[PDB]
């Protein structure tokens, strides 16, 4: 009865089902967990919001078309305005979190296409001016739930002030490495003939036990069309990709007044 | 060494000291606690925010003068915009909380005056129109941290629409009972010659295990000058009264989108 | 509904409600659907991003035809009243496309689902009363 | 022939019954019967369905 294709995930008051999964990835073979006393750093009693924040949040959907070059998000950035997770994140100097990432994309037995879904620790991307290096604005680096898109062309700005965004060049993974090697990162593939979802469970990954969530994204989430969407009756058809992410084992330290980041 | 006058209270990242206390009251002899399984009602796993929300929040101070008739606040209303407590309160349909209430008022050995500090369950107050009964607007009933003041005169409005506020008449405790009997409620007195603070620890009190915090205030906090402030060198002097309150054993159920109450 | 009819012989109810949905499109139709229950006291959800903050399930259409969403018992009072009543309001149930329904060619592009309701084993009722659903002329 | 039984609890515990009549039809209400088997209506299926398993396999 039980199948690698059929799965239920419940976190807090939220449940996901899928009937065409392909197993699930646990990044680096490690389930998330709370921070042990023998690895702890800040000494204040932490806030552990549990079910209020450790639950599935569904981002705005994006549209996959035959011309799409791909999508990226950063974490915890993508969830910064998500319910109580966002509130706990911004009321504290420090936070850590694992995640269940569930990417959703159904079609039909007559559609074809394949998405690579990658979770990338420290997903540092190139800037879009050659007058400077490492020259990206906070606002452009942290788009929130809307994320960003890849392009298949690199056109750096004439003036430094106009190029303070990522040069998200698809085949270089936006960072000067070949995209074909992205499989060294925890990943699944949504190949429409086989599956309609990808599930990745991510532990906290950093060189520290806990860090400033508003300064630092621990993971990038990359969705790249490896094989383009095609549908014979209408080559210009679009199918949604929906990203749903639950924080897990969240823990926060250094409570004060709320952080309100710059918006321009 | 140890004294009924000297006390430290620590909750979360916050500590209060006093060197001129007068013991402390535990309302009805009962310390607050979490909700037991054998008395529970909503079945979802509750959020228990612990140190993020169970900590001392200091309200705007008020000024005690020889002409002051008194002050009132409601709880949890007074704390509705206080840090993570406010966020947890408004993101959930249901909440319960106990409190440590610490009222602060110092002067000198040459000042005199006495404040009655009362914690009143279900502190229902009279409205200010005789064209209607029980006719109080949500906005006027829920002033937040600014609270309200008592008056020594009752002047109900000519028109019903103008009287939708409390008739907070001091000697009738704003509710048709004699103020001299308010001592049946958990209380302390700040008598300036004796003490400079009052401390009341309040359990959750209601006819239900848990309730809608945004609809219903469980406690009123009343501060009445029983003996007027007097100071011989300047009878028009003012001394501050500062109210600091910590939620305790907070527990919330029924998570959804955030409640944003009407403001007019 | 059968549950509604029984409830109208009682004054008080308590417990969890089960909503089961049966997709009746073609086998070739796929889709993901979000089903949500938002306990009361906040803005009623009219968008998926508000609905998904409440209790919810993401239903993947497939061989298993039906999906069950629960409205778990989440109430201030121990019983709610079997009448329209602000004090014992129960909250909001909504539904959104999580992705979309997708079909290949030669397939109907519009279709239906059926929604069922039933009480859970934690459910009970009190205080027998006459119903407003039957009457006669005198 | 007095029957002593538990009362239904109130706000804050036994009662006594004696039957006065020779016909059981004369008796007061039957005692509370909490019997139930919803599955004869909610799940009248020939082959057992385990919730956690697929309904159709």
């Amino acid at each position: 009865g039980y199948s690698d294709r059929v799965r239920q995930i419940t976190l807090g008051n939220s449940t996901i089902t899928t009937q065409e999964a392909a197993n699930a990835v646990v990044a680096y073979g490690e389930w998330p967990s709370y921070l042990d006393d023998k690895e702890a750093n800040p000494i204040d009693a932490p806030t552990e919001p549990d079910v209020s924040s450790n639950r599935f949040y569904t981002l705005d959907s994006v549209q996959w078309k035959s011309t799409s070059r791909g999508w990226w998000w950063k974490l915890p950035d993508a969830l910064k305005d998500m319910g109580m997770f966002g509130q706990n994140m911004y009321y504290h100097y420090l936070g850590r979190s694992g995640y269940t990432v569930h990417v959703q994309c159904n079609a039909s037995k007559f559609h074809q296409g394949a998405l690579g879904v990658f979770a990338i620790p420290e997903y540092v991307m190139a800037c879009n001016t050659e007058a400077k290096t490492s020259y990206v604005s906070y606002v452009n680096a942290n788009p929130g739930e809307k994320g960003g898109v890849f392009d298949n062309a690199y056109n750096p700005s004439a003036e430094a002030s106009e190029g303070r965004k990522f040069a998200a060049l698809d085949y270089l993974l936006g960072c000067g490495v070949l995209a074909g090697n992205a499989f060294v990162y925890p990943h699944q593939i949504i190949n429409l003939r086989t599956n309609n979802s990808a599930t990745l469970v991510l532990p906290y990954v950093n060189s520290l036990a806990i860090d400033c969530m508003a300064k630092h994204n621990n993971w990038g989430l990359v969705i790249l069309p490896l094989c383009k969407l095609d549908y014979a009756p209408n080559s210009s058809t679009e199918i949604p990709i929906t990203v749903t992410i639950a924080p897990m084992f969240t823990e926060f330290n250094g409570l004060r007044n709320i952080t309100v980041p710059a918006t321009q | 060494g140890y004294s009924d006058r000297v006390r430290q209270i620590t909750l979360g990242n916050s500590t209060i000291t006093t060197q001129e206390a007068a013991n402390a009251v535990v309302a009805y002899g009962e310390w607050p606690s979490y909700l037991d399984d054998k008395e529970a009602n909503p079945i979802d796993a509750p959020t228990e925010p612990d140190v993020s929300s169970n900590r001392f929040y200091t309200l705007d101070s008020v000024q005690w003068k020889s002409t002051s008739r008194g002050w009132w606040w409601k709880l949890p209303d007074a704390l509705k915009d206080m840090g993570m407590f406010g966020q947890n309160m408004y993101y959930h349909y249901l909440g319960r909380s106990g409190y440590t209430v610490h009222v602060q008022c110092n002067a000198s050995k040459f000042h005199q005056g006495a404040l009655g500090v009362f914690a009143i369950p279900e502190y229902v107050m009279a409205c200010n129109t005789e064209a209607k009964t029980s006719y109080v607007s949500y906005v006027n009933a829920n002033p937040g941290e600014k609270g309200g003041v008592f008056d020594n005169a009752y002047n109900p409005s000519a028109e019903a629409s103008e009287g939708r506020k409390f008739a907070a008449l001091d000697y009738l405790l704003g509710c048709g009972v004699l103020a001299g009997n308010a001592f049946v409620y958990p209380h302390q007195i700040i008598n300036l010659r004796t003490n400079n603070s009052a401390t009341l620890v309040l359990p959750y009190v209601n006819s239900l295990a848990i309730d809608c915090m945004a609809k219903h205030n469980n406690w009123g906090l009343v501060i009445l000058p029983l003996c007027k402030l007097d100071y011989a060198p300047n009878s028009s002097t003012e001394i501050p009264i500062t109210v600091t309150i910590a939620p305790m054993f907070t527990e919330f159920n029924g998570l959804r989108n955030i409640t944003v109450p009407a403001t007019q | 509904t059968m549950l509604g009819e029984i409830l109208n012989y009682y004054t008080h109810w308590t417990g969890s409600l089960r909503f089961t949905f049966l997709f009746c499109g073609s086998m070739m139709a796929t889709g993901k659907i979000l089903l949500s229950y938002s306990p009361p006291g906040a803005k009623p959800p009219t968008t998926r991003k508000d609905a998904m903050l409440g209790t919810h399930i993401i239903w993947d259409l497939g061989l298993q035809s039906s999906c069950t969403m629960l409205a778990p018992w989440i109430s201030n009072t121990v019983y709610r009243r079997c009448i329209k009543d602000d004090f014992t309001e129960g909250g909001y149930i909504t539904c959104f496309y999580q992705t979309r329904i997708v079909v290949p060619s030669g397939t109907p592009t519009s279709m239906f689902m059926l929604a069922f309701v039933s009480a859970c084993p934690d459910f009970s009722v009190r205080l027998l009363r006459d119903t407003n659903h039957i009457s006669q002329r005198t | 022939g007095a029957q002593v039984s538990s009362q239904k609890v109130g706000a804050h515990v036994n009662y006594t019954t004696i039957n006065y009549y020779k016909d059981s039809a004369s008796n007061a209400a039957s005692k509370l019967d909490f019997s139930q088997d919803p599955s004869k209506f909610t799940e009248p299926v020939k082959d057992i369905m385990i919730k956690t398993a697929p309904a159709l396999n």
């Binding site: 039980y2 239920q8 807090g12 469970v201 | - | 089961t20 084993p121 | 919730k51 309904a55």
Partner: peptide, 27 residues
């Protein structure tokens, strides 16, 4: 005899899928 009490449970990530069924069965 009482109505059903609710057990303490957390979350799952599992091939057990009690949220899905098939009411075609008559259940």
């Amino acid at each position: 005899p009482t109505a059903q009490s609710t057990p303490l449970t957390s979350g799952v990530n599992s091939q057990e899928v009690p949220a899905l069924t098939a009411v075609e069965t008559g259940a």
